[PDB]
Structure 1
Amino acid sequence: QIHDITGKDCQDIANKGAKQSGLYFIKPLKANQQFLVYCEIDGSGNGWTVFQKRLDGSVDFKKNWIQYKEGFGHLSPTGTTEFWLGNEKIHLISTQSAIPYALRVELEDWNGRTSTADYAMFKVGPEADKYRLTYAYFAGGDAGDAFDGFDFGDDPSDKFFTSHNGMQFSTWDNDNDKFEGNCAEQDGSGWWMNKCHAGHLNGVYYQGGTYSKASTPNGYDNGIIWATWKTRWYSMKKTTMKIIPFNRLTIGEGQQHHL
């Protein structure tokens, strides 16, 4: 069930010798708190600290501010359960030191195809700044950069309206988006909402992927979307949000060799 190796994060645990993905306790620097996390450890010696997972629609994501702060769902040795680690814990890990983390969003469609999108220098701010999302730049990935916003065509300024960098977190009971209405209440989730969204992984789990305006009384595009990879009417089958020290991603042809 729970492994004995501990560290500041899952990469620290992998560096110590851990070989199996599973449950481990981590103690982020300066927090004086220890908590369980699911580490995804591969053959390359990479250790990903997973903070979000969707795969079967078993966990209700319409939770309030406090629940999104503390975490909900379940952690399993097999990594086959849905959960949200908790905004407070995500903040503690991503800001524990001066070493930057990279966020990898892993997506899987209903046909078994998967894609990724990486963001460098990912951080989640303190509760005082409503767990604001900030990143330096999109680092690559075939899923596309939905966090930069997307032009759905229903407005020239769609891109500026759907960007996520710099947005505070919102829950139905703590609206911090840039919409006159309540993005979180309308979709029924917690997320870094703007004048809503281009990438939204905490949405409603729609079986089969395809859904439409007809699916909900008011016609909201509230599924698990990533506009740069699939249409807004296509909800993902699985999603994973996981972090790793950024230096782990610049280990290959991500460098200039000189002479």
Structure 2
Amino acid sequence: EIMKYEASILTHDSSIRYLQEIYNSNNQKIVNLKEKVAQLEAQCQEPCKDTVQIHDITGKDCQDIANKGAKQSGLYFIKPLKANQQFLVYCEIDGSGNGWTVFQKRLDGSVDFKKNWIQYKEGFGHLSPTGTTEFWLGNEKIHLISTQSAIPYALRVELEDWNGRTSTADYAMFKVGPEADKYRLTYAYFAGGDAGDAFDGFDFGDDPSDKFFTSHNGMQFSTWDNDNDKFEGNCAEQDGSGWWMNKCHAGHLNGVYYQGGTYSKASTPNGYDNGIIWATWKTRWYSMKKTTMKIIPFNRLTI
């Protein structure tokens, strides 16, 4: 017959069959693909890992912790006797097995030390398990530690210039008073140190009063919003920090972080020596590269 269409259907017959095999294959590949995402989804189920971690060891202070077993200097939770609650701190533990509870550390000026009374009481800055952070533990905290069990404590101060050169100064019978007494500084004496006893005051040269006008033993802590200095004006507000100021200072660690160290009365409108200073070791116009204040029960003595 002329019209031979019963020969094209078979062409379509195969065309249909072809597609069926593709649809059927797609369905399968799809089923497989779904079994893969499930495997992937399982991956993206945990959060990013924070390199920072706290140690399970706990005590009355960094030293008590070390005695329990702590070997690495990192972040732990201490809690003195009269403490309402525990709180994190950075501990420094040496080969001799000593626990240095650190309460102040400067190293880059990343933290603004111009903080109010409350900010100095509860503490400010950040805590790093490697002490590569800048901070202030908090007077109240410092108080609780130093004034506990009526046991003898000591203070070491480590300094560093912009040449890696360092020095220390120790004070025996270190202690910080309650808020009722404006967190007043107190120590029996200077236990020696290559940096010098700036706390014993320092007679600069302007006036013959300079020495006892810059002694820090027995001085109460002050801020711009809580003057307690032995100055008519506000030493804290002037320098812009929180410290135990007399007729100001001779050893000012919470001072302005001056890069490079050396500065002057030019770097200030009214010209102040408001930098991180220590008169006995360096000039009044040479700011430290690194600062670290830490305490420990005095009994670690022999030097």
TM-score (norm 1): 0.96
Within 1, Cα distance between the matches of 2:63 and 2:125?
23
Task: Give how far 1:157 is off.
Answer: 1.1
Task: Give how far 1:32 is off.
Answer: 3.5
Count of equivalent residues:
251
Task: Give how far 1:33 is off.
Answer: 1.8
Counterpart in 1 of 2:235? 183
Structure of higher RCO (CA pairs closer than 8 Å, 6+ residues apart): 1
Task: Give how far 1:99 is off.
Answer: 1.1
**Which of 148, 159, 163 is the equivalent residue of 2:215?**
163
Task: Give how far 1:53 is off.
Answer: 0.2
| Residue 5, structure 1, aligned to residue 29, structure 2 | no
Counterpart in 1 of 2:101? 49
Task: Give the superposed CA RMSD.
Answer: 0.8
Within 1, Cα distance between the matches of 2:206 and 2:96?
44
Q: What secondary structure is seen at the aligned counterpart in 2 of 1:240?
A: strand
Q: Deviations over 1:118-175 (max 9, x none)?
A: 0001110000000000000000000000000001111111101000001110000000
Q: Deviations over 1:185-240 (max 9, x none)?
A: 00000000000000000000000000011011111000000000001000000010
Within 2, Cα distance between the matches of 1:29 and 1:105?
25
Within 2, Cα distance between the matches of 1:216 and 1:32?
42
Task: Give how far 1:181 is off.
Answer: 0.9
Within 2, Cα distance between the matches of 1:151 and 1:143?
16
Within 1, Cα distance between the matches of 2:110 and 2:186?
29
Question: Share of identical aligned residues, percent?
Answer: 100
Task: Give how far 1:30 is off.
Answer: 2.2
Q: What secondary structure is seen at the aligned counterpart in 2 of 1:92?
A: helix
Task: Give how far 1:17 is off.
Answer: 1.0
Q: What secondary structure is seen at the aligned counterpart in 2 of 1:118?
A: strand
Q: Deviations over 1:25-84 (max 9, x none)?
A: 001012232000000011110110000000000000000001101000000011111100
Within 1, Cα distance between the matches of 2:162 and 2:77?
33
**Which of 131, 152, 157 is the equivalent residue of 1:79?**
131
* Long gaps (5+) in structure 1: 252-259
Counterpart in 1 of 2:282? 230
| Residue 218, structure 1, aligned to residue 267, structure 2 | no
Within 2, Cα distance between the matches of 1:120 and 1:19?
25
TM-score (norm 2): 0.82
Task: Give how far 1:97 is off.
Answer: 1.1
Within 2, Cα distance between the matches of 1:117 and 1:68?
23
Tell which structure's C-alpha radius of gyration is larger.
Answer: 2
**Which of 139, 152, 167 is the equivalent residue of 1:100?**
152
Task: Give how far 1:249 is off.
Answer: 2.1
Task: Give how far 1:250 is off.
Answer: 3.5
* Long gaps (5+) in structure 2: 1-52
